[PDB]
Design brief:
Number of domains of chain B: 3
Shape of chain B: globular
Distance between the termini of chain A: 22 Å
Helix content of chain B: 25-40%
CATH superfamily of the domain at 212-369 in chain A: GroEL
Helix content of chain A: 40-55%
CATH topology of the largest domain in chain B: Nucleotidyltransferase, domain 5
CATH class of the largest domain in chain B: Alpha Beta
CATH topology of the domain at 212-369 in chain A: GroEL
Largest interface: A-D, 71 and 73 residues
Oligomer: part of a larger assembly
Strand content of chain A: 15-25%
CATH superfamily of the largest domain in chain B: ATPase, nucleotide binding domain
Radius of gyration of chain A: 30 Å
Number of strands of chain A: 20
Order of helices and strands of chain B: EEHEEHHEHEEEEEHHHHHHHHEH
CATH architecture of the domain at 212-369 in chain A: 3-Layer(bba) Sandwich
Strand order of the largest sheet of chain A: 4-16-19
Strand order of the largest sheet of chain B: 6-7-10
Number of helices of chain A: 17
Largest sheet of chain B: 3 strands, antiparallel
Chains: A alpha+beta (521), B mainly alpha (354), C mainly alpha (39), D alpha+beta (534), E mainly alpha (60)
Strand content of chain B: 5-15%
CATH class of the domain at 212-369 in chain A: Alpha Beta
Amino acid sequence: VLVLSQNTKRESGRKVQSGNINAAKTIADIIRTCLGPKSMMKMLLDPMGGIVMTNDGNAILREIQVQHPAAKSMIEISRTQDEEVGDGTTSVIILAGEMLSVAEHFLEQQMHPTVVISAYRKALDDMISTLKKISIPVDISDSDMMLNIINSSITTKAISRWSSLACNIALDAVKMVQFEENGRKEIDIKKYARVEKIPGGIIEDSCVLRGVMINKDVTHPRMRRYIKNPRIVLLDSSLEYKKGESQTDIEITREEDFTRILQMEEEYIQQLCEDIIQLKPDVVITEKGISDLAQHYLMRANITAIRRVRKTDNNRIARACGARIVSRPEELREDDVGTGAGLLEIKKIGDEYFTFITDCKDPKACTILLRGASKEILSEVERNLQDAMQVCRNVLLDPQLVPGGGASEMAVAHALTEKSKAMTGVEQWPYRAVAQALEVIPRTLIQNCGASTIRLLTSLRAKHTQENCETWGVNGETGTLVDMKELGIWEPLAVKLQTYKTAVETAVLLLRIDDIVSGHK
Amino acid sequence: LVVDNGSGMCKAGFAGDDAPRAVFPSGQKDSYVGDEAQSKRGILTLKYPIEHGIVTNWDDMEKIWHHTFYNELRVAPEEHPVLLTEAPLNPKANREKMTQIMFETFNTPAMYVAIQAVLSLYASGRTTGIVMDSGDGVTHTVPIYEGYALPHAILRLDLAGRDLTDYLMKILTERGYSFTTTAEREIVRDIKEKLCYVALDFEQEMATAASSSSLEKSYELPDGQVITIGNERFRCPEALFQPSFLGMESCGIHETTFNSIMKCDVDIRKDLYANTVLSGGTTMYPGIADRMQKEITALAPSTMKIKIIAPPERKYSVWIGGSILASLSTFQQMWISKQEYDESGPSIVHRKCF
Amino acid sequence: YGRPFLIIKDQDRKSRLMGLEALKSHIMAAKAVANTMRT
Amino acid sequence: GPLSVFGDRSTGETIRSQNVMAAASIANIVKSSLGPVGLDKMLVDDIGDVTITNDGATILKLLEVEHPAAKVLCELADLQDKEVGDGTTSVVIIAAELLKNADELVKQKIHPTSVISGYRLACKEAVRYINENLIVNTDELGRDCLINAAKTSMSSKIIGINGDFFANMVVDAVLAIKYTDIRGQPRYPVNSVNILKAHGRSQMESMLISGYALNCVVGSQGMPKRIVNAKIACLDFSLQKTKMKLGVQVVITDPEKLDQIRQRESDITKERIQKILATGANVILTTGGIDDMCLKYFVEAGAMAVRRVLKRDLKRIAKASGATILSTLANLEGEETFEAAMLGQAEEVVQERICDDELILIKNTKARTSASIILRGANDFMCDEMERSLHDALCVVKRVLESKSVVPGGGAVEAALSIYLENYATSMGSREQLAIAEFARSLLVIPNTLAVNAAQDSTDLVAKLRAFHNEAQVNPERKNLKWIGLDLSNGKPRDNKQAGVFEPTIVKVKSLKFATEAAITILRIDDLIKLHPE
Amino acid sequence: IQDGKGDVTITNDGATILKQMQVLHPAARMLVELSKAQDIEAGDGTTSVVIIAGSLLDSC
Amino acid sequence: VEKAKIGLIQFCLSAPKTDMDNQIVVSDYAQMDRVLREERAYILNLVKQIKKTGCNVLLIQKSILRDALSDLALHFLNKMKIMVIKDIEREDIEFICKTIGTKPVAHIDQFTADMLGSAELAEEVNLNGSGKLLKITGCASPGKTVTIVVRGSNKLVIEEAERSIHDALCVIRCLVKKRA
């Protein structure tokens, strides 16, 4: 009597939608305390079988495998937000879950999803309109305010105690990978700002080198290790007789070609190295193999040779030393011999030798010296560094700032609550609803402490009404009503605007689910 | 990294996985951004640089390796010990050449690799027993005792299933309708994979297929015809056993196996007598096992006993062996790592001692 | 139907024949028994 | 005796009903997915691939169906998508209810031949009446009727709320590739506007490009990323290390030539490069790989070179910029030269970053324009949803523009045809008149499904529309009532022009033709033998 | 006629129908070959010839 | 293309290669240069022969083991505005030759301009995203074979229609066989 494959399972109704909202909860409850300057650390077991300790949304969730694929959907939006602007992922997740909770209070009374979505559209419209109406600028012309924003960002992070320190370690690294080509398109490539971490050392040892630091070593004892102005060239050819791509097996008939062939290969190496010796070099690095005949030749001329280097490191060194990578030693030009490095440095940071290319002119690609006590520690510091560079870049492309810690978000809740009553229509109830949902933001911040949330909430809600005192938030370490104009907490507008749009839209899209099927290919 | 450059494939998963996640054919995300589309299609263009059991090219292998686990496997090998496969036999030159490239472009902490025969033996669940490595193009004998392959005990024989098919089509001209074209080579191989069994022997099989003609199987195929009296089927295995069929008159493979076992001390041969498992590559049909059993029993003293072992599926056997060895929990004692690579280079790999 | 069910307990364990062809079945035996005794 | 069939034969109406059962089971399962109030259906693949889908064909295609007639309906839905692309869900429902009516009718003991002939003739009369008695003008609209068509497309889709920007975007995109086929009528290169997508910030953050954006990026940062003026050199020749011929072997007894042959392996490539680089080349597009030799040369020249370039996109861009397809430099004879008279024309090319990744982007291919849309969304699944939505919308609008004819919908056509055909069907007065009556009745499902998906009082509105159409038809004095349909925005009988709800006539014609075809096909099926499986 | 394979055939011509039954009884195979021969000779509506043959058998 | 002088070719078009084994050995760069230039020259010589024969549309049969089409051939034909169709069946030669008039040649020397089949119109049709065909119409040579197309919403309806039409043709073959 059957019709389709027996593996079919179709379900629908309000019950599965409610199950989806409870899944949203069961995600939202996992992260409810890692928010704000006062945070409570969280550890996770890596799905591959490792260990990880983080306190930001996606980094927590990106290492989480789930069933009931809606949880996968929120993991997807978490990764999207993280790679999108790079902060407040926990904020987006908790907002989405709680405001879905609020919307469920509205769906259950026979109401249709469509009117809810229309209210969602009007709500986000008003949110962005008033945010632009409230977004204020700031001049990007100082160390003061930039380091203040860095402090305000990483106060929610563990490196808050070294904030100013980290500030500088961030700031320098930004200014010396910043590059611009062809009279336009200034670029800040974090990949060129390569991160490296070294065992041992103190936390304060962290710094960005005005040059390039690499994990290699010289390739012969004779080649000296100290050069003040390196005549470096960027080789992209293997040091051996070229094979090419043609077929093989020339036919040997006589006794005067074999050793002749060996000698002609030796002389080919001779010429290939001679065209390099000509330009008076100091050091040479290559991405491929090196022949002993060639190293002997460069030894005769006192030149320094380096074996294979990573292509990303190759490009970074090309940016640093001002040389142009060439794969044609026999077509070498005087145009692109590297010059601009402050010192050749061959040291042993630890027990593995490193090469430290200190530079003397404006570089475009760094290696960051990092010192700590465990790979976990250095990894956490790494994540803090990406947060720092991303937020600094956002400020570089946004002269505007909006206070964090819960002030402007209460303010916009109030503003849109006022805006709701102007029109006439039941749609104001779902619309205004999201603002009520918005009121979740400070709760956790207080709930991270355990203070009397009700009085603080009512006080802030009132204060944001008279004389538009829309600048007051909570001092997280104290959990006390304060004005953000003095505490010094500010975040780039990009992160929170992204939070707005992403949370509202995922709320829009998670409502459209009513019917589900499983068991198919 | 449980990547394994097999006979023609590379299979990438993890040690704990039940299988590799990706294959190596030598538009998942290809409609979102296309970043990896170009890289993967370019790597796809590059060919397989391994033939006859010896490495033949080197730039392409690293070219493929870079992409294959930097764009889908999503792994940093700097934080991982490495476990690949290799061609069945090579001198130390290729090993110490591959070490250089691996380190100089990846700098991975540690390494260990092993001969495919060892991986197959592990997959079958044995640490002992010589396996008949009847690989494509060429076959080899690898007597394994406790796991390590003896450098003094590997024999190589040039027989191949390609050669068997060619010799069949060299005596299929005597069958009337010969077969030589690509389609005809394919149909000869298809019939071979359908029926080329062994009962006991040549003349007695031919008698029962011609005198009584009761070994006939009519071929009702779009690409085939009823042209086999039961002769050609059995005519594939016979040259597999008796060299003079092919015109290259030499000793039998059984002779090579027997000598490669006898040159060692008799006691250890007992353990080699224990399993004596086989491997495919040119053999897929039954009748092989008991026939070679009795054939070498003629060469085996009646005072001692011999066993024949042949699993039906051995397709990921090297991968199974690799996964097992990755969890052996003692193989790290034999890892060759940076502590020796940066100290001695390739000299220790050469076994300067002894 | 959209989903399988059963109205009869062991509905797939009992057979059901009908129609004029069903008569044929009886008539089938109607040969043998008669053909049994005609002798 | 017992049949030698060795199989299983079911007779009577059972299998008929079973077809009905099949036509039942899937139908309502996809029922919830068309119309301005169709809600999404979630599908979880066995490998954990959760999906969002609302158009019927995409819904069904991944279901595994073993019942034969249900499979037939499956490919019926697939074809309804592949030629039309709209009404993606309606057709299976229409056919299902048609089968319901037919099988019930035969259960009341009527000859199948009469009803089958009724099916054929009714299909013909219905298509005819659609042709004559609903003619209106689309030249009263234009550049805005396309907007309304896109609105009707997105009605059930995910972006039905933000149509103001997107519809203008898509209509301008259509105008950007508008071609001519027979030199008197327009032509559209379907699937020649690449819609490359990104997990962006929001639906409002997608932008349309008056140009072209590959899935490709600059090969290395050594090349300049913004060429001032674009003279494009498209290639199909593989630029790898040149190999002469697969059937040549070298035999050398004089080693002096030997090393020089090593030179040749480069020279040829190198030489053509100079030729390639002689004409002031700006950008190099090749399907073949590019190696360090060419990379270094192009860096020295500052001209972009991209490998693994696809083929169809390359043809599109070469045509758009006026560039030409090249596989070798040989001219009408053995002379292999490069000509500067065919270089592609464009303003500039940039490796723009969209969200966190860069890609090649072409600016304003000269002498014309081109269309490509960068879909940025909150994630991948919903962005694929816009992908499908906009593909369907472009299919609808290309159907509209190919044949400039359209009629209002939302049951307007449904109710009008039902009223006609029910008040018609006196031309035979026979066993087939009841058939035509059941045709007029069976179209009641479309208002029924729309109302149930909108929670409207179906009977009141259907009675109002039917009464207006009936009084218009039988009393053509106030024929204005024939210009009225049903809109689910507020459950209103309205002139379906202010909303713009408008659908091509050929769509209804074609869907009706295949629906009646399959219905007849099944109604001339009466017995089944289930042969024993192998 | 639904075959054991993944196909299906709507059919009306008698020879076709007779063919798709892969029965084991000789009499039906004889009828199948008769229908084949008739289609080779005439070609149309071999549904009748089987009925005629069976009716003659019943009469005899 | 309209009023095209259609050409059919059945022999190998690929690089000069003997039926029997060989290998062209190159001993220096100059020999490589001559090999390249003479390969180009031979190919263009052939293409110029066919173009000089007044041909308009080319037809290539199917083959294995050094097949009969080259990319350079397509580039030449595009440079001279010529169609081509490749990889056609063996026993269909009679149908095509009788229909169009072009006759098969296994060698360029026997290829002649008089042996061009002239059809009024060779056009490619679309099936609304369901493939592209090539219908040959207005042939000047007397063809004694005809073809007919069938379409339908599925494959079984067209199967039944095909069997019905085949049996109708059998009806008429018996009708003309003898007249009663």
